[PDB]
């Protein structure tokens, strides 16, 4: 099983300075050697064999070099310690003892499996113990994707190796919006080219006025041209010299490991596009190619041991069975209920297709708690041939509390879902024992269809036995060729231009949001015009819901339409992968759309949801898991966050096997980056252990005493070696060097978060940032903050493309474990309470503070930036419905950039607690913020600055209302995550009320200004141009 | 015009809660001029619209009905068989049944009882949230101790293999030292075996003590799970009652 906690020993957080280790020699002797806490295994071995001569039978002992230590780790594994440079405290031992044996077996493979296992958080050998054929087949079959990606990584070597490790961070399109192009001086960009110049190795610089659409090679070409102007070289001589520097030098962003390798326009890069928007001169460096390729080693992929082993292991089609479906519920082992409160228990069953039930739910006869015996055949209203490929059985032992008599309250106790068809298209048959899972927090529904399929690994849980039908044959699902034959016959038995009103009705349905009320007449209208829907391909998610999935005639006809359906946008394809569409052909079409059209920018952006979508999939081996792993192994930026999103949920036993097997395939083929990820994992494990001591052991201690303990533990060499010289988990381009322990401190915020400061070891750190500060926090779940900040970045990106400079600050946030995560520190930022405390305080204190920091010409830029950022957050916070804002969670930068921190909750979270139906305005625009926007005025609302701010808010509100389908699907893809704020589709309906999708576009503008007027007691006003919208 | 089956302006969230876990035939009408029926069929809430044109109603053209009440009463007696769905309107959810929850008549007494139910719901929710945290940490600690028991088994197996290793080597050398006449050396091999066997007893006792704590924590987990499954039906009923008292003050007020 995975490790219990990041401690050094079982029931002990830190070993004392000296500790007795019970070393067991190969001659049957036991030596109690006193080892220091942070001593290497080579030093322990050298001192052990010196003492071994004193103990009996020392002549049988061989040379100390021909031996390695082996011991039981906290994950109940007999780990072999080949890397003898590791310290005693960093070995994760269960008890203080070390057995001595000769190295045996494949040394290279055992080291690699230890490295893979350390990154996952569980041993690799536990997957070999799993008897499930699907798990063993997934490990063997997924290796083709591993070698497919690795072959192309060393095809155009050394360039292809650099493209994987340092991919080009670029936008999804080279076209620039109107506000960005006007900032460039007549379609040109000014850039400083910094370079360390031999022999003295000095930092030289020179200004360059070049075109914005120049590729990285064209930037190098113009840099040589300007430098050779004084020399007066010939046209051909210059062109020959340019070709040498182009083929031997490449550009790099100063202060971070971000390179410009692929031929993309300079302005398309995120660092350049941000510099144009902010009005900053970019800083680049011409790094020599030889220096970069020498640091990048060759990544090898050795086939695993389980792949080279010998395999351990009449048919009737589904449409041949003429009987109805029936499933027998036999018995449950035990149920945890009070006899005095609960009257009786029963197994509620249901056949589902993702979310919609295929037939009416059938329950077992009510039996008492002491005797859970049923042995009843439950007949469902569904013909076996009509069952679709994604058919599932959802069941749970429900209770009944008939104490009131008039009303009997039913509640679930333990749930479990079974895939009716296995990974090899075989319908389930015979007996089956299923261990049930606990009911998720807040779930009141008697069944959990969203939940994962399969038995619970923890066998000390209620075990329910079942018995499926046996028709004296192995029942398989029909082939695609058989399905296509039935579809042609269905069309033939039924049997050109279409009316304009019908075309306009179809156009209107496609533009509606995913959770819009689709009528039964509209379903018949969509199904009748199914072949006409090829001209408008965006209507496929609406057409699929209208298909009667509990009927083989309508399913087969839909399969043929999906096969030859035109391609759709990547944002539209994500909709077809949530819990509502589990059909393999629908999911396959969506994955095919993302393979061709989804760019690496959008894949990195919507990666949080795509990892959660893997949980809705019925089987381990599927087209989506192959696509995501292929992109993770060909791009290190995608691969890094892909690793951390899967690592964070390893504690959750519902996904431990699925995510653990996927991480094994990733770590085996990622190559050199596995060693870099192990350095990050080991650094995060020490931070978890260090915070656990300050919460349990030093709980009732003073801040001065805790700070003394914090510095003393960090100064030790074991902690210094692990937390210095490793890549930042919030951004792999940024790297963390030597720690600045004088700046590290325990913060006074909730759950005492630890402030950490690292020196940027990049040669040109002074140009971007010297201090890489990161707040480590253990206690609160930062999955909600991750989703909120990700959605803020998407809202910002949509506004920027439309021509809106509403500068948002989606700071880095990443969950790395069970309520463990990291938060990026925004430099030169303070809370409203901190600004007010500097100065008793007046409403003009925030404005006076900004006047002191920004003096002269930079005052107008600060007010503009404050208004632009404030308008964005006023709209973003209202739509999402984040926790109520206050002075301690609103921050403002020195330059005037306003941003929100500590989101915690979203949507109508407080509705279930209080019971008041109302769309709140979390960020209330108080007089303090209005005085800053209005540049110091008594009548703040009656100003041109406030009128421009109003326009900024209405522009951003309609921008999100236009792309509302994307935001609804992003939340729908996070339902299975297991977060308390997002569990059922009723929680998503809050954003529908704020965006006013049911009402017209003019009514949405009238609604938004009314919501602002109610919160701010007047100020906002209507315009005459609103009536001219198309309704 | 008004009827128990007609509810008026109702949100989609409330519609799903009325039809949740109901038999085929349950239905309700709500305002979208036009009105939308919601009939249950195969565990799904099927939405069937009622169009209005020149004083005529119906699900689809031709419109052969004078009023909405006539359309509902016609399909209540006769089966649908317009679409091809073999079901009919049978169980109408009523508005007067919800009124019996709020038994008080005057506005002051409704507000007095709401303050009591809201205070009781906050106390019950605080109890449920603290009991859920106890349930979660107990489940995690049981998993931590279960992993530790497996590690103790492998730890004992290695020390038992060390005893077996010493037994194999010692039998050859015990004759060599006895025939030589080196009783001082024989006592050292025997003392080292007793030292190793004493450590085995201490590790077995450590595993036995953690097995008793795991057994005790499993019984505590069962009692916390029993309490969690008993507080949930009381919490959701107390919340539903509070929502009815809030809806009573909304309907008996200015709008
Ligand atoms: C020292 C100085 N700088 C500072 C302080 C806090 C943050 C910050 C910079 O960077 C901006 C992101 N940020 C996010 C959060 N936090 C969150 O989101 O939750 C609570 C809380 C932290 F404790 F986690 N806190 C911060 C100051 N103003 O005091
Ligand atoms: Cl358990």
Architecture field, domain B107-251:
Orthogonal Bundle (1.10)
Give the contacts of A210 (CB within 8 A, at least 6 positions apart).
A188, A189, A191, A218, A219, A222, A266
Which positions ≥6 away from A101 have C-beta within 8 Å? A26, A67, A68, A70
Interface with chain A: mutation pick from B225, B242, B246, highest number of A CBs within 10 Å? B225
| Cα B247 from Cα B102, distance rounded (Å) | 10
Of A193, A180, A195, residue with least CA distance to A278: A180
The verdict on B46 touching A (C-beta cutoff 8 Å) is yes
Q: State the DSSP code for A354.
A: T
* Residue B217 to residue A231: CA distance in whole angstroms: 84
- Residue minimizing CA distance to atom 28 of ligand 1: A830
Which helix (H) or strand (E) segment is A242 a member of? helix A235-248
CB of A826 closer than 6 angstroms to any ligand 1 atom: yes
Helix (H, G, I), strand (E, B) or coil at B49: strand
Chain-chain contact of B155 with A97 (C-beta, under 8 angstroms): yes
Cβ–Cβ below 8 Å for B143 and A458: yes
A690-717 burial, b at 16+ Cβ within 10 Å, e below that, comes to bbebbeeeeeeeeeeebeebbeeebeee
Q: Is the dihedral of CA A462, A981, A510, B32 positive or negative?
A: positive
Q: Is B168 on the interface with A (CB under 8 A)?
A: yes
DSSP secondary structure, A412-457, as one string: EEEEEEEESB-TTSBBP-EEEEEEPEEPPTT--SS--SSSPBS--S
User: Considering CB atoms only, which of B49, B148, B165 is closest to A519?
Assistant: B49
The answer, for B242 touching chain A at a CB cutoff of 8 Å, is: yes
**Facing residue for A350 by CB, picked from B43, B147, B239:** B43
CB contact under 8 A, B49 and A78: no
Nearest to B196 among A30, A818, A986 (CB): A30
DSSP-assigned letter for residue A199: T
Q: Give the number of the atom of ligand 1 that is nearest the alpha carbon of residue A902.
A: 18
Q: Is A241 in the pocket of ligand 1 (CB under 6 A)?
A: no
> Would you say A412 and A439 are in contact if contact means Cβ atoms under 8 Å apart?
yes
Among A823, A828, A838, A886, the mutation site with the greatest number of ligand 1 atoms within 8 A of its Cβ is A823
Q: Chain B contacts of A78, Cβ < 8 Å?
A: 154, 158
Looking at CA atoms only, how far is residue B24 from chain A in angstroms?
8
Q: What CATH superfamily is the domain B12-98? A: SH2 domain (3.30.505.10)
Which residues are A891's β-sheet partners? A831, A899
Q: Taking CB atoms and an 8 Å cutoff, what residues of chain A touch B83? A: 520, 524
Name the residue facing B195 among A30, A71, A361 (closest C-beta).
A30
Cα A932 to Cα A845, A848, A896: the distances in Å are: 9, 9, 10
A196 lines ligand 1 (CB under 6 A): no
Find the A929 Cα to ligand 1 centroid distance in Å: 20
Using only C-alpha atoms, chain A has a radius of gyration, in whole angstroms, of 32
Task: Give the ligand whose atoms come closest to the C-alpha of residue A757.
Answer: 1
What distance in Å separates residue B186's CA from the closest CA in chain A? 9
Q: Could you tell me if B174 lies within 8 Å of chain A, comparing CB atoms?
A: no
Among chain B residues, CA nearest to A78? B154
Report chain breaks in chain B, C–N > 2.5 Å, as residues after which they occur: 32, 81
Residue with tokens 């890069």: A269
Q: Is the CB of A883 under 6 A from ligand 1?
A: no
Other CB atoms within 10 A of residue A349 CB: 19
A827 Cα nearest atom in ligand 1: 9
Cβ–ligand 1 distance for A829 under 6 Å, the answer: yes
Q: How many CB pairs under 8 A join A and B?
A: 166
Partner residue facing A356 (CB), from B44, B230, B233: B44
CA distance A794 to A810: 9
Ligand 2 mean position to B133 CA, how many Å? 14
A645 and A607 Cβ atoms separated by less than 8 Å: yes
Structure tokens at A819: 């309520």
Pair A279, A186: CB distance under 8 Å = no
Contact A838, A830 (CB under 8 A): no
Q: Per-domain residue ranges for chain B? A: 12-98, 107-251
Rg (CA), chain B: 37
Residue owning the nearest CA to atom 14 of ligand 1: A901
Closest ligand 1 atom number to CA of residue A811? 12
Work out whether the CA dihedral B172, B178, B179, B185 comes out positive or negative. positive
Q: Ligand 1, closest atom to CA A753?
A: 23
Residue closest via CA to ligand 1's atom 27 equals: A830
Q: Does B118 touch chain A (CB under 8 A)?
A: yes
Say how far apart CA A241 and CA A254 lie, in whole Å.
25
A827 CA → ligand 1 middle, Å: 10
First CA to last CA distance, chain B: 22
Record the tokens describing residue A511, joined without a space.
């533009």
Angle at A677 between CA A675 and CA A683, to 5 degrees: 105
**In which element (H, E) is residue A70 found?**
strand A68-72
Nearest atom, ligand 1, residue A777 CA: 24
Q: Which of A198, A121, A80, A125 is nearest to A655 (CA)?
A: A121
Domains along the sequence of chain A with CATH: 1-104 (3.10.20.90), 107-144+601-669 (1.25.40.70), 166-295 (3.10.20.90), 315-476 (2.60.40.150), 496-598 (1.25.40.70), 829-1028 (1.10.1070.11)
B124, B235 Cβ separation under 8 angstroms: yes
Task: Kindly state whether B43 is in contact with chain A, defined as any CB-CB distance less than 8 angstroms.
Answer: yes
Measured in Å, residue B229 CA sits from the centre of ligand 1 at 39
- Which residues in chain B are contacts of A411 at CB distance < 8 A? 229, 232-233, 236
Structure tokens that stand for A175 in this block: 């076209």
Identify the nearest ligand to the CA of B217 by its number. Answer: 2
Residue with tokens 């938004």: A1008
Minimum-distance CB partner of A99 among B83, B158, B199: B158
Determine the Cα–Cα distance for residues A235 and A233; give it in Å rounded to an integer. Answer: 7
CA gap A625, A540 in Å, rounded = 23
User: How much distance in Å is there from the Cα of A899 to the middle of ligand 2?
Assistant: 43
Resolution stated for this PDB structure, in Å: 2.8
Which chain B residues are closer than 8 Å to A409 by Cβ?
233, 236-237
Nearest CA in chain A to B152: A76
Pairwise CA distance, residues A923 & A845, whole Å: 19
Say if B197 is an interface residue toward chain A (CB within 8 Å): no
Contacts of A60 in chain B (CB under 8 A): 169
Cβ proximity of A739 and A723 under 8 Å = yes
Are the C-beta atoms of A746 and A703 separated by less than 8 Å? Answer: yes
How many CA within 13 A on the CB side of residue A334? 8
The whole-angstrom separation of Cα A50 and Cα B248 is: 86
Instruction: Report d(CA A181, CA A185) in Å as an integer.
Output: 9
Residue A438 CA: which ligand is closest?
2
Question: Across the interface, which of A95, A519, A524 has its CB nearest the CB of B47?
Answer: A519
Q: Is B220 on the interface with A (CB under 8 A)?
A: no
DSSP A748: S
* A970/A960 Cα distance (integer angstroms): 13
Q: Evaluate whether A292 touches A261 at the Cβ level (below 8 Å).
A: no
Contacts by A792-798, CB closer than 8 A, 24 or more apart: A792/A876, A793/A605, A794/A605, A794/A966, A794/A967, A794/A970, A795/A872, A795/A875, A795/A876, A795/A956, A795/A959, A795/A960, A796/A872, A797/A605, A798/A959, A798/A960, A798/A963
The Cα–Cα gap between A411 and A400 comes to 7
Q: Which residue has the tokens 């068809």?
A: A421
């Amino acid at each position: 099983p995975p490790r219990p906690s990041s401690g050094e020993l079982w029931g002990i957080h830190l070993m004392p300075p000296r500790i007795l280790v019970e070393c067991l020699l190969p001659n049957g002797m036991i030596v109690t050697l006193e080892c220091l806490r942070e001593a290497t295994l080579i030093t322990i071995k050298h001192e052990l064999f010196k003492e071994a001569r004193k103990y009996p039978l020392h002549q049988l002992l061989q040379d100390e070099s021909s031996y390695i230590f082996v011991s039981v780790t906290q994950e109940a594994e007999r780990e072999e310690f080949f890397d003898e440079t590791r310290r005693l405290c960093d070995l994760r031992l269960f008890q203080p003892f070390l057995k001595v044996i000769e190295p045996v077996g494949n040394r290279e493979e055992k080291i690699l499996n230890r490295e893979i296992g350390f990154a996952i958080g569980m041993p690799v050998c536990e997957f070999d113990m799993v008897k499930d054929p699907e798990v063993q087949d997934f490990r063997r079959n997924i290796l083709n994707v591993c070698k497919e990606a690795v072959d192309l990584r060393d095809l155009n070597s050394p360039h292809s190796r650099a493209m994987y490790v340092y991919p080009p961070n670029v936008e999804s399109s080279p076209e620039l919006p109107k506000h960005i192009y006007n900032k460039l001086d007549k379609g040109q960009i000014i850039v400083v080219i910094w370079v360390i110049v031999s022999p003295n190795n000095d930092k030289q610089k020179y200004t360059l006025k070049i075109n914005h659409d120049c590729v990285p090679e064209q930037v190098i070409a113009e840099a040589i041209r300007k430098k050779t102007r004084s020399m007066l070289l010939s046209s051909e001589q210059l062109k020959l010299c340019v070709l040498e520097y182009q083929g031997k030098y490449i550009l790099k962003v100063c202060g971070c490991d971000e390179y410009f390798l692929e031929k993309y326009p300079l302005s398309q890069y995120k660092y350049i596009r941000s510099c144009i928007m902010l009005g900053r001169m970019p800083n680049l460096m011409l790094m020599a190619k030889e220096s970069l390729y020498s640091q990048l080693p060759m990544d090898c992929f050795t086939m695993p041991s389980y792949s080279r082993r010998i395999s351990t292991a009449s048919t009737k089609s589904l449409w041949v069975i003429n009987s109805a479906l029936r499933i027998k519920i036999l018995c449950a082992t035990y149920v945890n209920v009070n006899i005095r409160d609960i009257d009786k228990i029963y197994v509620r069953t249901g056949i589902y297709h993702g979310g919609e039930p295929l037939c009416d739910n059938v329950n077992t006869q009510r039996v008492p708690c002491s005797n859970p015996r049923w042995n009843e055949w439950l007949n469902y209203d569904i013909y076996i041939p009509d069952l679709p490929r994604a058919a599932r059985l959802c069941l749970s032992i429900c209770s009944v509390k008939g104490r009131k008599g008039a009303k009997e309250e039913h509640c679930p106790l333990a749930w479990g879902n079974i895939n009716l068809f296995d990974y090899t298209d075989t319908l389930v048959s015979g007996k089956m024992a299923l261990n049930l899972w606990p009911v998720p927090h807040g779930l009141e529904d008697l069944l959990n269809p969203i939940g994962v399929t399969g038995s619970n690994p923890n066998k000390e849980t209620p075990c329910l036995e079942l018995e499926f039908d046996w028709f004296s044959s192995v029942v398989k699902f029909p082939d695609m060729s058989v399905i296509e034959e039935h579809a042609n016959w269905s069309v033939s038995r039924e049997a050109n231009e279409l009316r304009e009103n019908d075309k306009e009705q179809l156009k209107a349905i496609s533009t509606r949001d995913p959770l819009s009320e689709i009528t039964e007449q509209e379903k018949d209208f969509l199904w009748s015009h199914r072949h006409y829907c090829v001209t408008i391909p965006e209507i496929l998610p609406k057409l699929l819901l209208s298909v009667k999935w509990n009927s083989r005639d309508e399913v087969a006809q839909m399969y043929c339409l999906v096969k030859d359906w035109p391609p759709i946008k990547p944002e539209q394809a994500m909709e077809l992968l949530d819990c509502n569409y589990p059909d393999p052909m629908v999911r396959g079409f969506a994955v095919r759309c993302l393979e061709k059209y989804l760019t690496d920018d959008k894949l990195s952006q919507y990666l949080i949801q795509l990892v959660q979508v893997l949980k809705y999939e019925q089987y381990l081996d599927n087209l989506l898991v192959r696509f995501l792993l292929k992109k993770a192994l060909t791009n290190q930026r995608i691969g890094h966050f892909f690793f951390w999103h899967l690592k964070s949920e390893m504690h959750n036993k519902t996904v431990s096997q699925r995510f653990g097997l996927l991480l094994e395939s990733y770590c085996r083929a990622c190559g050199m980056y596995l060693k870099h990820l192990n350095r990050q994992v080991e650094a995060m494990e020490k931070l978890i252990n260090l915070t656990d001591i300050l919460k349990q052991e030093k709980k009732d201690e003073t801040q001065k005493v805790q700070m003394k303990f914090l510095v003393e533990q960090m100064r030790r060499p074991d902690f210094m070696d692990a937390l210095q010289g490793f890549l930042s988990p919030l951004n792999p381009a940024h790297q963390l060097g030597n720690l600045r322990l004088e700046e590290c401190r325990i913060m006074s915020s909730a759950k005492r978060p630890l402030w950490l400061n690292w020196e940027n070891p990049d040669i040109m750190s002074e140009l971007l940032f010297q201090n890489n500060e990161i707040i480590f926090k253990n206690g609160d779940d930062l999955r909600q903050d991750m989703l909120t900040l990700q959605i803020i970045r998407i809202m910002e990106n949509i506004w920027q493309n439309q021509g809106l400079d509403l500068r948002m600050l989606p700071y880095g946030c990443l969950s790395i474990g069970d309520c463990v995560g990291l938060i990026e520190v925004v430099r030169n930022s303070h809370t409203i309470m901190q600004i007010q405390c500097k100065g008793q305080f007046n409403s003009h204190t925030l404005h006076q503070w900004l006047k002191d920091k920004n003096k002269g010409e930079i005052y107008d830029a600060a007010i503009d930036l404050f208004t632009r950022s404030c308008a964005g957050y006023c709209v973003a916070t209202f739509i999402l419905g984040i926790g109520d804002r206050h002075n301690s969670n609103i921050m403002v930068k020195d330059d005037g950039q306003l941003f929100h921190i500590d989101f915690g909750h979203f949507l109508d979270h407080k509705k279930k607690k209080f019971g008041y139906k109302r769309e709140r305005v979390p960020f209330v625009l108080t007089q303090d913020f209005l005085i800053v926007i209005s540049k110091g005025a008594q009548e703040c609302t009656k100003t041109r600055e406030f009128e421009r701010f109003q326009e900024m808010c209405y522009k951003a509100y309609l921008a999100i209302r236009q792309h509302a389908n994307l935001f609804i699907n992003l939340f729908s893809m996070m339902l299975g995550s297991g977060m308390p704020e997002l569990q059922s589709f009723d929680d998503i309906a809050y954003i529908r009320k704020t965006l006013a999708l049911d009402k017209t576009e003019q009514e949405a503008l009238e609604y938004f200004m009314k919501q602002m007027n109610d919160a701010h007691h007047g100020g906002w006003t209507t315009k005459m141009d609103w009536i001219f919208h198309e309704i | 015009q008004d009827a128990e089956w007609y509810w008026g302006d109702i949100s989609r969230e409330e519609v799903n809660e009325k039809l949740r876990d109901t038999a085929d035939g349950t239905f309700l009408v709500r305002d979208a001029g036009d009105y939308t029926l919601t009939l249950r069929k195969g565990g799904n809430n099927k939405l069937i619209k009622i169009f209005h044109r020149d004083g005529k109603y119906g699900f689809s053209d031709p419109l052969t009905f004078s009023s909405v009440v006539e359309l509902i009463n016609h399909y209540r007696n006769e089966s649908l068989a317009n679409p091809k769905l073999d079901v009919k309107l049978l169980y109408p959810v009523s508005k007067y049944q919800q009124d019996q929850v709020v038994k008080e008549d005057n506005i002051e007494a409704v507000g007095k009882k709401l303050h009591e139910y809201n205070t009781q719901f906050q106390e019950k929710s605080r109890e449920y949230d603290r009991l859920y945290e106890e349930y979660t940490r107990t489940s995690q600690e049981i998993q931590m101790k279960r992993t530790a028991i497996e590690a103790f088994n492998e730890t004992i197996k290695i020390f038992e293999e060390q005893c077996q290793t010493q037994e194999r080597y010692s039998k050859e050398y015990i004759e060599k030292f006895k025939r030589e006449g080196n009783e001082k050396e024989i006592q050292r091999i025997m003392h080292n075996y007793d030292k190793l066997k004493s450590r085995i007893s201490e590790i077995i006792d450590s595993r036995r003590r953690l097995e008793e704590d795991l057994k005790k924590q499993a019984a505590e987990y069962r009692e916390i799970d029993k309490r969690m499954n008993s507080i949930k039906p009381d919490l959701i009923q107390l919340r539903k009652t509070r929502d009815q008292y809030l809806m009573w003050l909304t309907q008996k007020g200015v709008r």
